[PDB]
UniProtKB/Swiss-Prot annotation, chain A:
Annotated organism of origin: Thermus thermophilus (strain ATCC 27634 / DSM 579 / HB8)
Residues shown, of full length: 509 to 565 of 1524
Protein's job: DNA-dependent RNA polymerase catalyzes the transcription of DNA into RNA using the four ribonucleoside triphosphates as substrates.
The organism's place on the tree of life at top rank: Bacteria
Protein name as it appears in the record: DNA-directed RNA polymerase subunit beta'
Subunit structure: The RNAP catalytic core consists of 2 alpha, 1 beta, 1 beta' and 1 omega subunit. When a sigma factor is associated with the core the holoenzyme is formed, which can initiate transcription.
Family of this protein: Belongs to the RNA polymerase beta' chain family.
UniProtKB/Swiss-Prot annotation, chain B:
GO cellular component, one term: DNA-directed RNA polymerase complex
E.C. number: 2.7.7.6
GO MF annotation list: DNA binding; DNA-directed RNA polymerase activity; ribonucleoside binding
Protein name, as recorded: DNA-directed RNA polymerase subunit beta
Amino acid sequence: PEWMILEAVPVLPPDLRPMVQVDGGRFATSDLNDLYRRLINRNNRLKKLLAQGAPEI
Amino acid sequence: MEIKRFGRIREVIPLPPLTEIQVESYRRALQADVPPEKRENVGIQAAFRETFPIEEGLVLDFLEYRLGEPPFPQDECREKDLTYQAPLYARLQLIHKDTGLIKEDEVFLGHIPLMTEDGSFIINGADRVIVSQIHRSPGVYFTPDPARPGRYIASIIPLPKRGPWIDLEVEPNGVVSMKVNKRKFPLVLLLRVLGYDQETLARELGAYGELVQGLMDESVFAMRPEEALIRLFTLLRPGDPPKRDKAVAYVYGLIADPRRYDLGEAGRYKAEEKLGIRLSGRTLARFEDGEFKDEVFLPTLRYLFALTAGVPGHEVDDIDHLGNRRIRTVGELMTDQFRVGLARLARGVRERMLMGSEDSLTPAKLVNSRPLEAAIREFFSRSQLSQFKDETNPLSSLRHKRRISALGPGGLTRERAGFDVRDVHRTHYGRICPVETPEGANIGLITSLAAYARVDELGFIRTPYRRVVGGVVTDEVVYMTATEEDRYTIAQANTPLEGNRIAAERVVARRKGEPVIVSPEEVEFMDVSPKQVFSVNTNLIPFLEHDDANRALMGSNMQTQAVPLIRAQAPVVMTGLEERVVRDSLAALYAEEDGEVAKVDGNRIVVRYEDGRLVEYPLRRFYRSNQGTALDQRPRVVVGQRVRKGDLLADGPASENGFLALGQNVLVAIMPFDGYNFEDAIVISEELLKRDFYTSIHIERYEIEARDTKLGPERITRDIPHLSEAALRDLDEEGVVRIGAEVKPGDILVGRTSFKGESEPTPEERLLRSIFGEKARDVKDTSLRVPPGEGGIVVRTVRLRRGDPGVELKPGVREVVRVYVAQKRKLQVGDKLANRHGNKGVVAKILPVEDMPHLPDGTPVDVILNPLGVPSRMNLGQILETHLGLAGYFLGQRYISPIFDGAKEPEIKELLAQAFEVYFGKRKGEGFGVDKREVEVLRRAEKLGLVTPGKTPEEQLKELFLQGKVVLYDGRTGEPIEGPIVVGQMFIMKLYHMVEDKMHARSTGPYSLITQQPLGGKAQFGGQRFGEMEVWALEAYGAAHTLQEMLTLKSDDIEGRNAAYEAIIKGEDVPEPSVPESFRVLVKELQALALDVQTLDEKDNPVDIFEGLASK
RNA sequence: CUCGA
DNA sequence: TATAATGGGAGCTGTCACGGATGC
DNA sequence: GCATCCGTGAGTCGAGG
């Protein structure tokens, strides 16, 4: 049952959420990368906040 | 040739300016010709007035705005892919309340797109049209509660995104509830906040039967407006600290704030008319002298109770009535987006006012124009109602400008659109065409403004009627809304008149849409014309009264898809609207005043007017429209010709001497022909090709960029590696194909080289290189070539280079080259033809002339249409047309047959007798008697009861001819068709659906990034989609290997497709397929959701489909 | 979005 | 790195049938 | 045992842009 809670979040292979250069030399990318970046930023900030003894709120 | 016109109905007024719905709306929104101080509080002026002043320097106020001249002309904007627009400046002033200091400045806000003379826009080089949107008018409505019979719902609706919808209901427990933002609460509370006491409410609402008791709550009256206000703020905002000024701010912003709540002027007017009151502004209440003041609530509740009780003079509202649905035109929509952008700008302003030095603030420092420009650009580029202009022909553009959409932003989401919104309401009469609407999912949701209809200043559609007083029809015309129209008895336009007096004692009229027979005494108004019932397109179908509406819809719609031909003709049978369409679409060139033509050229006409001034009119020649059809003007005057005001100077596309020319007049026979015209297919003669009938000019645009890369620059050049002189033959010195060159699929249009990606040569390449001893070049061929199935003659080149005058490309781009390629398209097998009556079909066979059925005089027909296409379609108009055509063929004349006022059978019979005398008398004069074959056909016809037995051959042939039928000989045998055949002239158009643009095939080609499946679309050299249903078909056939092949080797199996291709080129059979890549994708994407998907064997042991590549 | 079947 | 500054601001909503917790 | 709010489906392919 506890497996319904995540401790390690899987990360999809990069080719399935590509960062590719289009005809004009510009870049196109999947939304999954922005979602993942949001996740990673918040997680890292959480680890730092815990490391610096932040309050409860 | 002579034009005879039928009909007795005299139109009192001409059609209004057909694009006025666009032009006047935008002109109203901009107010550009109005000096600033005289501007009304409407449009963008009103937007400014709503945004400013910006408070909390302390104040930033708006004085006025101005629009400058366009930095570039329209044609230049089309060329350089620029937006045709005007600079917008706003005069702002900054005031510090304490210091009293006042700084004033004119700030640049960016540009606003300008509407062209014809009602369209130029956005990034492409012509666009803002389609008008129909929506529910703001106001106060009362509808039957679908759950509780005898109970009603009151709804207060403001402008879109200008306040929430508020509902008033009488609850089963008796209390009167109010719903705002999905929050049900007792209305008594709000009534208390507004400052109503139990006394006032009792004396005001006591008349109704006990309803008022559901309004009586002691706990509400036991508290002053403030406590009630805070109570309401708690009821609407849970969690938010109930501070006084926050409650005041929220409620004011919800009900009283004119910058946030806004019934339209239309909503205000309708609320006033319905509730029998008068509004000071356009909100539901005011904030006056520290307290709130009612405006709409009490009257609405009053009406609701009155209606619930049964008090006379109170009724529910039909929401589909065109008195309750209005049109938002381009001006209003643009103004809305302008308002949004301005709001964002204001937020930015306050944000900057909080920061920075507080003494050194100028208007320029506070104002960032970017969000406004963004909102405008977003509206004109990516809004739903901003559409790529249809300009296949001028009628296309005209119709596109007069379209009305129920969809779009704030509009109806589809599939939530039931039968009601899509219905033809009775009030559509004279306002919205009942015929012209799309087939399929958009039916009833996209419509067309009726020909005489006008949108009024409030947005309601109005139609013209003639005043009738004492059975006498005046020339006084009144434009009415549907609400106004519902008051009168309105006679039909075909009511018999002697002079201006009604001549019948029984006249057909309408009363609230209901047909009724009345006396002339009862007639208050009379229709202007049958024309006013239908759109411009439907008004172009002759004998419309004989066509079933379902096919009329098709002919109507298909006129817009007609292609301009090089030898375009106006129809032999017209409705009489063909000139106004050309004129109003601004296709053709007309004389500005009286004068004499000084110069006539293919490029330009110079006219000397009466003033003595020389005016030069340049002629647009072989220009490319949005759809690639040819836009060119041909001079129709000669040197020294005397012209009057409004006379034709040049014919535009699809114009023949000022008449709308959407196609060709062809001699048709109505008969089966060896299966070649089976199921709507069409047989034509090669003679049509020989004399360039249905030949059309089309121009395609190709484009290529040379940019800077990290590996070296791309460049346009002739020095392309590994190409012969044969391949470079038509390229100029710079590497661009020459003007006049004929290009075919595979041919280079623009030479380009690109530095290769960092190449690690495989050992094979190294060995081969050693064998041939040739250094691999640094650059590779990346040239622009003609795609498969395309080509023609190069007519124009455009080159834009960085570092050159007037030129600045997007960052990194060194140069851009454009090549225009023109083709002359002859009619071919598979091209789509149509008439105005909904008869459509593709050309299935092109017959040599000797194979065509022919008249006894040796004249072959041009087109053979199948009679089986008529009975179940019920579009007999096309038959009548044909008959009249026959007459016109021999009399050398054309006809104007107005809809519902058109030529009748007897007149056509007369014309056919006249034509018969020409058709046969000539023969008898030339010294020839009746033919044996004709005698045979006459015998058969006697058996068919088509001719009276006893008469001479000539008399019988004449009878047949009067039935529109002739003797026809089979070109293959010389024997006559056993029966007489309907033959005559018909107007047929070639539609934009040409097989040349549709034929597409693919062996292998580009695949998708993630799925590794073939791309879609002809442009991407794509593959056909084998969807779920096609799969079902193969499954139902039990075609397991075919299906698996489609699933694997043919799509998304990489090893499989490679091995299959190699096997086929080796002449070996294709190998066994393996795992589709998209299944691996599925597995990985399920793993990303923390699901473990495992492929097992029969022993439940895992099988790796990733071949160890993904297992550590 | 619009068009086509 | 030091005047003092202390709770946001979006929000037009014209369908329908079912499985569901619920919750009246 | 019975009304209430929430989540979810709603034809295909093809074309343009």
